[PDB]
Write an enzyme that holds these catalytic residues in place. Sequence first.
Site, PDB file in Angstrom:
ATOM      1  CD  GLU A 266      10.116  -8.423   5.272  1.00 25.41           C
ATOM      2  OE1 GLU A 266       9.484  -7.594   5.972  1.00 25.41           O
ATOM      3  OE2 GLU A 266       9.635  -8.993   4.260  1.00 25.41           O
TER       4      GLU A 266
ATOM      5  CD  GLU B 119       8.148 -12.925   4.253  1.00 27.22           C
ATOM      6  OE1 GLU B 119       7.309 -12.015   4.036  1.00 27.22           O
ATOM      7  OE2 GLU B 119       8.753 -13.052   5.341  1.00 27.22           O
TER       8      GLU B 119
END
Length: 724
Positions: A269, A519
């Site tokens: 991320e 995720e």
Amino acid sequence: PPPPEVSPVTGNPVSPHYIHSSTLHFQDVNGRSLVLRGVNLSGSAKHPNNQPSHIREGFWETAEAGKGDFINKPLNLDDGSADLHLARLKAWGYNLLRYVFTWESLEHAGPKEYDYAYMDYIIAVLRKCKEWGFRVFMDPHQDVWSRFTGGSGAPLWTLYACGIDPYHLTATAAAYLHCEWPSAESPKPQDFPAMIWGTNYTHLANQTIWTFFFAGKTYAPKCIIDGKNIQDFLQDHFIDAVGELAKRIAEEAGDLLDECVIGWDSINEPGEGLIGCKDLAVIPAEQQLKKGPSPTPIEGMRLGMGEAQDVQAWNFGPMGPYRGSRQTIDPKGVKLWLSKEDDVKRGSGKWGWTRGKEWALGTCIWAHHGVWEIATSTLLRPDYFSTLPTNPGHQVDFVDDFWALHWLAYSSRIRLHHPESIHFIQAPVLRQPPKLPESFLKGRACSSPHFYDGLTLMTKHWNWFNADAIGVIRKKYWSIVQAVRIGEGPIRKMIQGELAVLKQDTIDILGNYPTLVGEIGIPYDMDDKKAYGYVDGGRGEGDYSSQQKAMDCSMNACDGPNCLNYAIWNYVPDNVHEWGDNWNGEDLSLWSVDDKEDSGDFSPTLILDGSRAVAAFCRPYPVATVGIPERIDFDITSTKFKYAVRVRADDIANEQVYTEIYLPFVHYAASLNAAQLSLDVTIVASHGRVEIQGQTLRWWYPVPGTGEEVYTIEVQRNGGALRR
């Protein structure tokens, strides 16, 4: 065409455990489509032993001393507990682990001082994962750059390398640290607002550091360190550190490669910093995460020079952020920027680099590049970061111009030490991946986006409404109200549609490659922790109905026509009700000690005790399929399971090559009283024959003589659902 006998990367013949990643689905060497499902292991590796996010004591001192005791996270290898956790995950049907490690845990001691002992600990953990039959891909993990800037990831010395005094982050509002909230002098970590940690990406420290990392040579050309731009210094040290772990695995435990460790994720991320900012005087309405005091980029720079500012504060409402009151932040002259004397003492001079003479210290580095004027507070170049400063008509794209370039360097290093590595390509959050060259992909890649039911995550409530956040982000709707859905049915279908969009990004952009949702998860601390007994006199303790629906909606979204691979966030051995996952107020672990009290030779206690909403995350699914997965449907209440597969005339099926389906005792056992566990199900298959063993269903069928045909198999527990 069936899977080849030689690797598309090296041209060498492949072992029998090789997983092909050359088509829309993972495949084994006999052509079976594989589905990989599991968990992230683990969020607990984000921070050293005994230093969770809420505890300020020892937080700075241990890192300043160059320490970083991460040994025995995620799994303790000294006390026997490690095998019990892996047994539980395997008994839940999982065959995949996204393995979390941080740059800090590898290089906390200083630049090029690598923690070889932690490296060997990871290898030992990987060996046990292999013994239990897991596939693993490695996640170099970070959140908002580092623990010292609100999250996890980079070692403390990177802040000093960037000219930032870590002790001034709170005073200037350059970052919000859980352990110094609302102030370093009087912390109240239990009051840390829900999910506010994520706004650190749009405060000054992350805004600076990420601009350095990905584009320092474009926007901070004066920032020279060891004769390199800060951009190369930071990227080279990060790539070197990950590269040393990969090298270590390759040289000291080469047997793990490909059979267990199948590939590497890219940096988790990644932040965009200020890159692409259109106007430094405003926060765009498009920025979807606003919560708490939210300085504009220029307000944050003024704050970083010690000047008080009155900033907009944001609340998260049912339709997203809306404005609250304005709040004054007064650093009282304290500046974010390291003074020179402090650089000599604690920065360059201590950690051992040479900072260039045009890198002004103790003053704003963006003012020093002409972005604004400190004397008058005038924004001089509001669009500075939206184009190239020396060719200013051209407009920049963070993903194509800066992220992708980092990814080429990173991915080349991975392949140097792991020749058959699958590249798990994690584009920046909420962005489509760029087109990446086949000269680097080489037919061995997989798209690895993350997806969260954001409304549920941010509000920590399973709402009777929801909204299509991806469709809004991508301007598919003319008004946000037409993105809204009401009711379980419409909400579930909408979220499943969101996952289909991410699947489509892969084939549109990267090619015919698999997709894996790296995720996905939901918060368990819903409703002020009513399920933990924390409110209403204890009423509602143990009732995880709401978490179960939320979980089941997110899991169903990976079923349907999507039939996706995924890794649930997350599994945390030391999760507790009071502090959750011990990180920024998040509580996404499937399992908690506070919730305690092929074979059926284990106890139901393994798969039930300590679990929360197990009925939703432990689900039937096809581990390996002769043909192409077409559709999966699972209903908790009825236990009904239906799997449709597209089977072609050239597919390979025989007595040794068949479809394998996991059927969980959690849903299909005859009885779950704490005497061997055994499935009690009715099976209806349209073609072929079946047999069950333990939690495994095996399904043989002949392929069609011509063309393609959809076969189906339906399963349910005899007599309906269990009561657990």
